[PDB]
Design a protein around this ligand. Sequence first.
Ligand SMILES: [Cl-]
Ligand SMILES: [Cl-]
Lengths: 437, 437
Amino acid sequence: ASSTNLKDILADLIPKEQARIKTFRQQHGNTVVGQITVDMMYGGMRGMKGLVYETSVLDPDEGIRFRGYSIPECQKMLPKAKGGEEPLPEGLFWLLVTGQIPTEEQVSWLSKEWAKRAALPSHVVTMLDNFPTNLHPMSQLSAAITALNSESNFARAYAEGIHRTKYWELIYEDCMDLIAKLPCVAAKIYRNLYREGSSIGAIDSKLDWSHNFTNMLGYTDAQFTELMRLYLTIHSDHEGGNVSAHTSHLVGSALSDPYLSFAAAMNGLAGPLHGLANQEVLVWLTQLQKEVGKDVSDEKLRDYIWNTLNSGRVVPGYGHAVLRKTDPRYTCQREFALKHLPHDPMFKLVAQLYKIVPNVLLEQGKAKNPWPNVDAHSGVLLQYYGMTEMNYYTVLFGVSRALGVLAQLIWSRALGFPLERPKSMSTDGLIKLVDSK
Amino acid sequence: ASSTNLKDILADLIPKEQARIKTFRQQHGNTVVGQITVDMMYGGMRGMKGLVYETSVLDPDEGIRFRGYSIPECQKMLPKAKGGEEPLPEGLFWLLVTGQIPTEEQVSWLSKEWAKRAALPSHVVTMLDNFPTNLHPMSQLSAAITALNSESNFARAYAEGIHRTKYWELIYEDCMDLIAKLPCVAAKIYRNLYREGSSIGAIDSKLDWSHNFTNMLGYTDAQFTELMRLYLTIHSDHEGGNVSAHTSHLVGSALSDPYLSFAAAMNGLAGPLHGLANQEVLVWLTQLQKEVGKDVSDEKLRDYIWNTLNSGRVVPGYGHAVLRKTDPRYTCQREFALKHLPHDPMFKLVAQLYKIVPNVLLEQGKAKNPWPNVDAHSGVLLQYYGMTEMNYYTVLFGVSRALGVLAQLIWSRALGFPLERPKSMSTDGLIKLVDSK
Ligand SMILES: [Cl-]
Ligand SMILES: [Cl-]
């Protein structure tokens, strides 16, 4: 079929993957991987191996891996814009879908595809323009994505009857269309809330996805576009157990189309326990710089931190239960800042905390692995380029996370994963059960 | 505090329930209730005891129970409208929230409360009126519910900081407000799609929820209002493992407010594997009546069915894996039809299938428990009163299911249930794992 066509490459991979899972399940489907306890059921399935998600896996020693590749390896190998040095999100998506590193010519193809499919129907433009400024940007995003399901071709084809084995084909189309549209929707929200409802302008079919997005947002700094490339790539996926991904997976399994699956996933991302870490850190940093001042000594910063731990408070963005070192997504952003904004005062604070915090967390003993995550670094970077509207920052996370959750959604359907339908129990039934047990 | 105030009654129950779970978990939290196998992970958690959901439990011998009470018992004991004989959904909600059967005076209070809170902001009315007729009614519903989260008082209070132990209080308020609003939203959708965008009119504060809903829909038959009461009560809840309920539970656990949780749940309900059983049956019945005609003999119907099973097809609405008898939600609707529309031709067919199908399924041996479910009866009833717009039927299911999923959501938050966050694995990691295992 095609070297550069993603869909031809996918069609060739899928049957070989079906056959490999079938023979694995034939010898080991009955193999016990864990026990369920009462505490796990009350505890939000904490520590329960419950689903198969193919695109990304956490390595406790190396950080999140994308189809086997660590972040450093991705930065190295994935194609960059011309004149750029940050990896294009297009190439990340290719890798997640195929397991393979795309050539420059495959990535260039994918940029064009996304530009060609980027169109919004008039009812969605009209809806966005009529929303009030007190409707949160993530609610605006989800509702507009729900309203685009009028454009789903899977929804249409399923109603006309199609064979199970062919679902993935139209799923693939709808996912490609949704990704293409996302930056248009997100930029209309940004401009309507924060730039007096000015026009997002036109798509340029020779640019990459991120560049079209930053144009439509109204930004002109070439290095902001480089930041956006990096940012969208590194927030793209993080296993399937997080609420945004699991929500897409669960709604997807009912054969709701990608529009509906993704909007549902954005409603979970909007939750304060999933979507707000970047903002929480930036607010704390802001408070901190006010308290201690602009050229604080290492000693005086260390005191502040100790005073804070010995007050039952925590340092946001620091500490993990599993990963044994600094998140490499934190390190990526560090290096960017060292090249492009090393003299910024809020970055200097973020760098100074990186020097000092980890050791203070050890003196306290408590926190197991006292290293920072991706959210400890992202706000100060956005802020520097003038993207200061913190309520909006979860929208960017969402546009990124689409790449991961939709790449998986194609494979959930290719492999014929069934409806997700665990069994619930009430407190009374558990009590009855452990007494008969 | 109050006899008739639901919130005072709830406040008194919650600490006693907290203490009972804490002491149960203290002696049995480590008690193993199941094993996880490879097949369960590929199989959408099939047969995995994974969450605690308090409001409803399936009895394999008696059907779904609401806080311990079977459906027959509910019909008996729950208050009816004056002059009516079908249970008010208000009393069902009371039972789900409290575990207790409300008095007539408590139900009357709850009717008034819901009328008092029923208001839509102008941006939502404007949004609904501008949607095109090709946007599916469930997409319209979800997007309008997402857009109402501007009215969430939990969202507001959480941002201002509130104590964990007090979440349930504002959750309760938002749930009460959402239930109050649901019929307004749903009736605007109905009228805009199917009655030329005519007005839904005003709420009457002396009527019950269902009566206000059927008024706003444009219906005037007193027996349609009785049907609506029954329908909304019996579709209200069915454990937590179904996609709509589990989706609300999962999004909820991130501390997304009820608006966002419920809209996400409607995106899962809209999936063809969850939300379309009523319609599938009615379409099949329609085809059947055309094939065999209006006064078909028992013999000729039996032949048709056999010809259909011996052709690798199935009879929709019949057969269960667990419940060992006819769904009592099917039986409820049967009796209604016997009193109010026993001479309707499509009901006669539905009754004739009930006489004949179960035995033909046994001759085939195959289907384990050859009895009908709630979805085998609901369409012909809607159809009879002139509610013929099949795309809309999932909206009614949604308005009903709110009662169940929101009653639980209050208790998820009262009891401090954490984030839901199972662990995912890729095919490669499972392979690696069973080889080290
Ligand atoms: Cl995440
Ligand atoms: Cl259900």
